[PDB]
Design a protein around this nucleic acid. Structure first.
Ligand SMILES: Nc1nc2c(ncn2[C@@H]2O[C@H](COP(=O)(O)OP(=O)(O)O)[C@@H](O)[C@H]2O)c(=O)[nH]1
Ligand SMILES: [Mg+2]
Lengths: 234, 72, 61, 299, 65, 158, 172
RNA sequence: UUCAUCUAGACAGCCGGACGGUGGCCAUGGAAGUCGGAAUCCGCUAAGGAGUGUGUAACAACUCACCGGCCGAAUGAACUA
C-alpha cells in the first residue's frame, strides 16, 4: 500500500500508440521516394496558426513533424541502415523540434521564402528581452499601460491571486480593482528572461519578439549529398 | 487522560463449550446444504518461468507422438 | 362531479427547474393580460388584505 | 415513540418557520411568487405536513401493536418495521427538502421593505443611473456597472428628511415589451411599482449612453403610464454633464412635452456627480410624497 | 446586508491572502485523512464509514463504465 | 490616423442593435444612434438572420461591413421567410439546400480556409450544414460527405 | 371485410407502424412508422408508391389529409404529418416532396388536423395549440394557451365530412 | 497471479503547443467549449473534445483530454494470499 493515486478524468480523446509512429515512419519513407529536396527545419515554440500558415503557403509540398527519434529512424540513423545514400548526415542534423520539408520547388525559392518569412511571437524564457516593461502606479489595466488607460479595460479581479502568488507582484484589491502602490519594473530591455517574467509578458499580451524558421540543411535526391543552408542560425 | 475499561481476554468455559456446540451444528448444516443444493460444478505454465519455450516444445512433441502412438 | 382536481404541476416542471442553481424558469407561468388588469388586481388585493386585517384586529390583536 | 417525536419536531420546525404566502402583504406575496413559484412552495410545505401526519400515524399504530408482543424477536421486528416505514416516508421527501433549503437560504437575504412607510421608487431603462442615484442619496452598496441588468433584484436604502425616515427602492430595469414576454426580473420592478404607494422617479438618459434612444425611453414611460395611478410621479433627466435638455432637438422637445402632458408629472434635471442637484430632486420627491400622504390622512 | 452580499464582498475585496494555498494543502491532505479515518474510527462510526466508502466506490465504477 | 476594428454579432436588419456596443463605444464617444443606423443599413441583405458585423472607426467615423460566416451563409441560402421574436420562436432549420449553392458558399469561404481543396472546404460547409440541421440534395449532409469521400461527387474547381 | 380474410400485406417499414390513414378520395393509404418514416401504398395492388418519405428525426405521431373540397380538381391532396420531434411536415404526393416544415412547438406534437377553412391545428406537449395558415407559407396564425398539461387530442366539428370527402353512406 | 507501456524512449517533473470553419443550431436581458435542450460534423495535424474543470454579466485568462522538447530505465493496472 501507500502509493500515489492517479487522477481519473472522463475525456473524449484517447492516447496514441505505436501505430501512429508507424504511420509517420511509412509516410516519411514514401515522401523520400516521392519528392526530390528534403530540408530540415527548426520550429521551436511555434504557434499552430503560424505552422498552418506555412503549410498553406507551401501548397503541393509536404511538411512532416513528429518525434525526432522517429524521424531520424525513418531517415536512417547510420550508413548501414539509411534509406538512401548519404542520408545519415541529414538524419544526424536533426535536433529539437525537427520538421522535414519534402519539395520539388527551387532551392533559391525555398531559401528566399525562409529568409523573408517572419512573424511576431511571445517572448520566451531564456531569451533576450525585446523591450522594457513597467506596470504604472495605480489601477492595473489589462494592457498594463501599453495603450491609454481610458481605452483599456481594467484587469479582471479574478487574476489578482495569480498576479500576487505566481507572478510575485505586490497587488491589492480596492473596490474590485487590482492596484499597486508603486510602479513595478518587470523586465529590462537587453536582459535574459526567466519563466515568471515570460509569463507576466504573455499575460499582459506584449508580443515584440519575432519568430523566424531556422533551416539547418537539405538533401538532394539526384546529387545524393547534403548541403548546409545556415539560415536564421545566429 | 482518562483510560477506559479494557475488555477481558480470560477464557470462559461456558462460552468455549457453547462455541463447540455452535461449530458442530454449523458443520452439520453446511454438510446438509452442500448435499442438497443445486449448482453446476489447470492453470497452465506460469509466465515468469524462464524455460517456457522448452516446456512448450516438449509438450508439442509429446502431443505429436501420442497422436500416432495409438493409431499405429 | 362538476369540477376536476387541479393539474399536477410536478409532472411538467420539477423543483430543480422551478428554483435553484439549475433553474430554467425565467418567465411567469401565467403572465398578466395587461398593466391595467394587473393594477386593478393589485388594488383589489390591497383592499381585501386591509379588510381582513381589520377583521382580525377586531378580535385577535 | 422517541423516533417518531424526533421526526415530528423536525417537521414542525420546518413548518412554523416558513411564511404563509397567502397571509402576507400582497407585495411580499407577489415578490415571493416571482422568486420561488408559489405553487411549488405550497406543494413542498404540504408534502412536509403530510409526512408529519404519516409519521405520527405509524408511531401510534406500532406502539399499539407492540402492546401485544410475545417475545424479544417479535418486538424487535415490530420496532424495526416502524422505523423502516418512517424512513421510507422521509426518503420520499428528497426533492421538496432540497427545494426548501435553497428557498430558505435565498429568502433569508431578502431586504426588509415596509409597504406602508414613505418610499422613493426609482425606475427606468437600464444604464440610466438608478444605482448611482441610490448611492448618492443613501448608503446602500448597490453595484454600478456600464452594462444592462447589472442589478437583478430590488435594493433598499434609507435616509432622513425633516426628522422622518424614508426608504428608497432601486429596481432592475424595465424593457418596453408586453407582459406575456416580460420576465421575472422585470416583474420584480413591475410589482414594486404596482404595490408600493410612493413617489416614482423615472430616469431618462438623453445621451443614449444606455443603448436606448430618447424615443424608446418616452415610449417606455407611456407604456408604464397605467402603473403609477394614485401615486406621485416625477421624471428625472440624468447625465446632464454629457447632454442637456435645453440643447436637444425640436422633435425630442415635443416628445418631452408629450411626457409632461401626463398629470401631474414634473421634469427635473440632475447628474449623479452633482450633490446639490441630487439633494434638490430628493427633497422635491419627499415634499410631493409628504403632501400626498398628509392630504390623504386629512380626510 | 441584502441579496448576494457575500459574493459581492468577495468580488469587491477578494478572499483571505492564503485562501487558495490553504485549500490546496487541505485537499492534498484529504487522502492521508481518509486513510487515518478508516484505520482509526471505531464502532458504529467506523462501520458507517466503511459502508459509505463501499457505496462511493460502486458509484465511481458505474460512472466509469 | 489609426483604424479601430470592432466585431459583434447582430440580427440583420434590426435597427438599434448597437446597444450592446455601448460599453465599447462609450470611451470612443461615437453616437450609438448613428452606429445602429449604419449597422441596419449594412445588414439590409440579411433579414432576421444573425450575422457578424465589423465596425471600422477612424478619426470620427464609423463604417459597417458584414463578415461572411458559414452558418449565416447557410441560413441565407436556406431561403426561409423572415420571422419575428413576438410571433415565431424555436424555429428549426430543416429545409433543402442544393449542392451548387453549397459549392458557391464554399467558394465564398475559401479565402480564409486552411483546407487545400475546394472539396475540403465544401466538406467543412457540409459539416456546418449538418450542425444547423438542414438537408443537401434531399439527403444528409454527412451522407453527401461520405459520397464525396467515396468519389461519387466531383467538386468542379481543382 | 366481406369474407373476413386478409388481402394485402404492406411490409416496407422498419419499425412499428404507429399510424395509418386513408386518402379522402380513397386512392392511397399513408402509413407513419416508428422508424421516423412515412410510406404511401396503392391498396388495389397492395404496392408501395416510390420511396419512403424521410426528414422527420423522431417517430410519426399523426397523419392528416388535405380536404377534397379544398383540393383543386386535377391535383392530389397533400399530407400533413406530425412527429415526436416537435415539427409538422407537409408532403406533396404528386411530386413526392416536402413543401413546409412548421417548427413552432417547443415539445413533442401530439396531433395535427387539417381543417376545412385552409388552416391546420396542432396540439403538443408544451400545453399549447398552434393554428397555422397553409396559404401563408405555413405561418402560425394563433397560439392558444389555456391548458396546464399536455393536450392529448383535438377534434373539429367537421371532422366526419373532412375524412369522408365526397362519398356518402351509399358508397357512390 | 494475469494483463498491458518501454533507447523508432518507462513512471514522475519542467517547458511549449493545445489550431481553423466557429461566437456550430435553438433558447436567453446577457450564454462565445464550461446556467440549459438536442446535433455532436468537417478540415489541418505531432496533437488538439463542437470541450475535463476553475473563472467572467458576457468575453478574456488558466487548466486536462491529447502531442512534442529536456531528462534516461524500468513502470502501470486489475486481482489473490
Ligand atoms: N456622466 C454620468 N454618468 C453616469 C451618471 N449616472 C450613471 N452614469 C454611468 O452609467 C453607467 C451605468 O449606470 P448604472 O448605475 O448601472 O445605472 P442603472 O443600470 O440604471 O442602475 C455607469 O458606468 C455610470 O458611470 C451621471 O449622472 N453622469
Ligand atoms: Mg442598476
Amino acid at each position: 500500500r501507500s502509493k500515489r493515486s492517479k487522477l481519473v478524468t472522463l475525456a473524449q480523446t484517447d492516447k496514441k500508440g505505436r501505430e501512429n509512429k508507424e504511420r509517420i515512419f511509412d509516410e516519411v519513407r514514401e515522401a523520400l521516394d516521392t519528392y526530390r529536396y528534403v530540408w530540415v527545419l527548426h520550429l521551436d515554440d511555434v504557434r499552430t496558426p503560424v505552422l498552418q500558415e506555412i503549410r498553406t503557403s507551401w501548397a503541393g509540398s509536404k511538411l512532416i513533424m513528429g518525434k525526432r527519434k522517429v524521424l531520424q529512424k525513418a531517415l536512417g540513423e547510420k550508413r548501414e541502415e539509411e534509406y538512401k545514400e548519404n542520408l545519415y548526415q541529414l538524419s544526424k542534423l536533426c535536433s529539437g523540434v525537427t520538421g522535414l520539408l519534402f519539395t520539388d520547388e527551387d532551392v533559391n525559392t525555398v531559401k528566399e521564402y525562409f529568409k523573408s518569412y517572419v512573424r511576431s511571437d511571445y517572448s520566451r524564457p531564456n531569451t533576450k528581452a525585446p523591450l522594457t516593461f513597467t506596470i504604472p502606479e495605480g489601477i492595473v489595466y489589462s494592457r498594463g499601460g501599453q495603450i491609454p488607460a481610458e481605452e483599456d479595460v481594467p484587469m479582471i479581479h479574478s487574476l489578482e491571486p495569480t498576479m500576487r502568488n505566481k507572478f510575485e507582484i505586490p497587488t491589492k484589491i480596492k473596490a474590485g480593482k487590482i492596484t499597486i502602490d508603486s510602479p513595478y519594473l518587470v523586465c529590462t530591455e537587453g536582459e535574459k528572461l526567466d519563466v515568471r517574467q515570460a509569463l507576466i509578458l504573455k499575460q499582459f499580451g506584449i508580443a515584440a519578439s519575432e519568430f523566424k524558421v531556422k533551416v539547418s540543411a537539405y538533401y538532394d535526391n539526384d546529387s545524393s549529398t547534403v548541403e548546409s543552408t545556415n539560415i536564421n542560425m545566429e | 487522560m482518562r483510560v477506559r475499561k479494557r475488555q477481558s481476554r480470560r477464557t470462559s468455559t461456558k462460552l468455549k463449550e457453547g462455541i463447540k456446540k455452535k461449530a458442530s451444528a454449523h458443520r452439520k448444516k453446511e454438510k446438509k446444504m452442500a448435499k442438497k443444493d443445486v449448482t453446476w460444478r489447470d492453470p497452465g505454465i506460469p509466465s515468469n518461468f524462464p524455460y517456457k519455450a522448452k516446456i512448450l516444445e516438449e509438450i508439442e512433441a509429446k502431443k505429436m507422438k501420442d497422436l500416432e502412438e495409438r493409431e499405429l | 362531479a362538476d369540477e376536476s382536481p387541479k393539474a399536477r404541476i410536478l409532472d411538467t416542471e420539477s423543483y430543480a427547474d422551478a428554483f435553484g442553481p439549475k433553474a430554467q424558469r425565467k418567465r411567469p407561468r401565467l403572465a398578466a393580460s395587461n398593466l391595467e388588469d394587473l393594477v386593478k388586481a393589485t388594488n383589489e388585493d390591497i383592499t381585501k388584505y386591509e379588510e381582513k386585517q381589520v377583521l382580525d384586529a377586531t378580535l385577535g390583536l | 415513540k422517541y423516533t417518531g417525536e424526533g421526526f415530528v419536531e423536525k417537521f414542525e420546525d420546518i413548518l412554523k418557520g416558513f411564511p404563509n404566502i397567502n397571509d402576507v402583504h400582497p407585495f411580499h406575496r407577489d415578490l415571493m411568487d416571482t422568486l420561488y413559484e408559489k405553487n411549488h412552495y405550497k406543494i413542498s410545505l404540504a408534502a412536509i405536513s403530510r409526512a408529519k401526519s404519516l409519521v405520527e400515524q405509524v408511531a401510534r399504530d406500532y406502539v399499539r401493536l407492540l402492546k401485544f408482543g410475545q417475545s424479544l424477536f417479535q418486538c424487535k421486528q415490530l420496532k424495526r418495521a416502524a422505523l423502516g416505514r418512517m424512513a421510507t416516508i422521509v426518503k420520499k421527501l428528497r426533492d421538496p427538502l432540497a427545494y426548501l433549503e435553497q428557498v430558505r437560504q435565498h429568502i433569508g437575504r431578502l431586504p426588509s421593505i415596509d409597504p406602508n412607510t414613505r418610499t422613493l421608487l426609482i425606475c427606468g431603462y437600464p444604464n440610466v443611473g438608478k444605482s448611482s442615484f441610490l448611492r448618492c442619496i443613501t448608503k446602500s452598496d448597490v453595484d454600478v456597472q456600464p452594462y444592462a441588468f447589472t442589478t437583478k433584484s430590488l435594493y433598499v436604502g434609507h435616509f432622513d428628511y425633516k426628522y422622518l425616515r424614508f426608504q428608497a427602492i432601486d429596481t432592475p430595469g424595465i424593457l418596453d415589451r408586453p407582459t406575456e414576454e416580460m420576465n421575472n426580473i422585470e416583474m420584480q420592478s413591475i410589482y414594486a411599482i404596482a404595490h408600493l404607494r410612493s413617489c416614482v422617479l423615472y430616469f431618462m438618459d438623453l445621451s443614449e449612453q444606455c443603448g436606448f434612444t430618447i424615443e424608446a425611453q418616452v415610449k417606455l414611460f407611456h407604456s408604464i403610464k397605467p402603473l403609477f395611478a394614485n401615486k406621485s410621479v416625477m421624471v428625472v433627466i440624468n447625465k446632464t454633464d454629457i447632454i442637456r435638455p435645453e440643447d436637444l432637438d425640436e422633435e425630442r422637445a415635443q416628445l418631452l412635452e408629450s411626457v409632461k402632458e401626463v398629470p401631474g408629472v414634473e421634469i427635473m434635471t440632475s447628474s449623479c456627480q452633482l450633490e446639490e442637484n441630487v439633494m434638490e430632486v430628493r427633497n422635491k420627491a419627499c415634499e410631493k410624497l409628504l403632501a400626498s400622504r398628509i392630504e390623504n390622512k386629512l380626510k | 446586508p441584502q441579496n448576494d452580499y457575500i459574493e459581492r464582498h468577495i468580488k469587491q475585496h477578494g478572499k483571505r491572502l492564503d485562501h487558495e494555498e490553504r485549500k490546496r494543502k487541505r485537499e492534498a491532505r484529504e487522502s492521508h485523512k481518509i486513510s487515518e479515518r478508516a484505520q482509526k474510527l471505531t464502532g458504529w462510526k467506523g462501520k458507517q464509514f466503511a459502508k459509505k466508502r463501499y457505496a462511493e466506490k460502486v458509484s465511481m465504477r458505474k460512472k466509469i463504465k | 490616423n489609426e483604424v479601430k476594428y470592432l466585431y459583434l454579432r447582430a440580427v440583420g436588419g434590426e435597427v438599434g442593435a448597437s446597444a450592446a456596443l455601448a460599453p465599447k463605444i462609450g470611451p470612443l464617444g461615437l453616437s450609438p444612434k448613428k452606429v445602429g443606423e449604419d449597422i441596419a443599413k449594412a445588414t439590409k441583405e440579411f433579414k432576421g438572420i444573425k450575422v457578424t458585423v465589423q465596425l471600422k472607426i477612424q478619426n470620427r467615423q464609423a463604417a459597417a461591413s458584414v463578415v461572411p460566416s458559414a452558418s449565416s451563409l447557410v441560413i441565407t441560402a436556406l431561403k426561409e421567410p423572415p420571422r419575428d421574436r413576438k410571433k415565431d420562436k424555436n424555429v428549426k432549420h430543416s429545409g433543402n439546400i442544393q449542392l451548387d449553392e453549397i459549392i458557391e458558399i464554399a467558394r465564398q469561404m475559401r479565402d480564409k480556409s486552411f483546407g487545400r481543396t475546394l472539396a475540403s472546404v465544401t466538406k467543412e460547409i457540409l459539416g456546418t450544414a449538418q450542425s444547423v440541421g438542414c438537408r443537401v440534395d434531399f439527403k444528409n449532409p454527412h451522407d453527401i460527405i461520405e459520397g464525396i469521400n467515396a468519389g461519387e461527387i466531383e467538386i468542379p474547381e481543382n | 371485410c366481406d369474407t373476413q380474410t386478409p388481402m394485402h400485406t404492406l411490409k416496407g417499414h422498419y419499425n412499428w407502424v404507429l399510424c395509418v390513414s386513408w386518402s379522402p378520395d380513397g386512392e392511397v393509404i399513408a402509413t407513419g412508422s416508428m422508424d421516423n418514416t412515412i410510406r404511401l401504398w396503392d391498396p388495389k395492388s397492395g404496392q408501395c408508391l416510390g420511396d419512403a418519405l424521410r426528414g422527420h428525426s423522431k417517430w410519426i405521431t399523426s397523419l392528416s389529409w388535405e380536404p377534397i373540397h379544398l383540393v383543386k380538381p386535377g391535383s392530389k391532396p397533400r399530407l400533413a404529418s406530425s412527429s415526436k420531434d416537435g415539427t409538422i411536415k407537409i408532403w406533396d404526393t404528386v411530386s413526392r416532396v416536402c413543401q413546409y416544415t412548421m417548427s413552432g412547438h417547443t415539445n413533442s406534437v401530439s396531433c395535427v388536423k387539417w381543417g376545412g377553412q385552409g388552416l391546420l391545428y396542432s396540439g403538443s406537449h408544451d400545453r399549447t395549440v398552434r393554428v397555422w395558415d397553409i396559404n401563408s407559407q405555413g405561418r402560425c396564425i394563433n397560439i392558444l394557451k389555456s391548458h396546464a398539461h399536455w393536450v392529448n387530442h383535438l377534434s373539429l366539428s367537421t371532422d366526419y365530412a373532412l375524412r369522408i370527402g365526397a362519398f356518402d353512406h351509399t358508397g357512390k
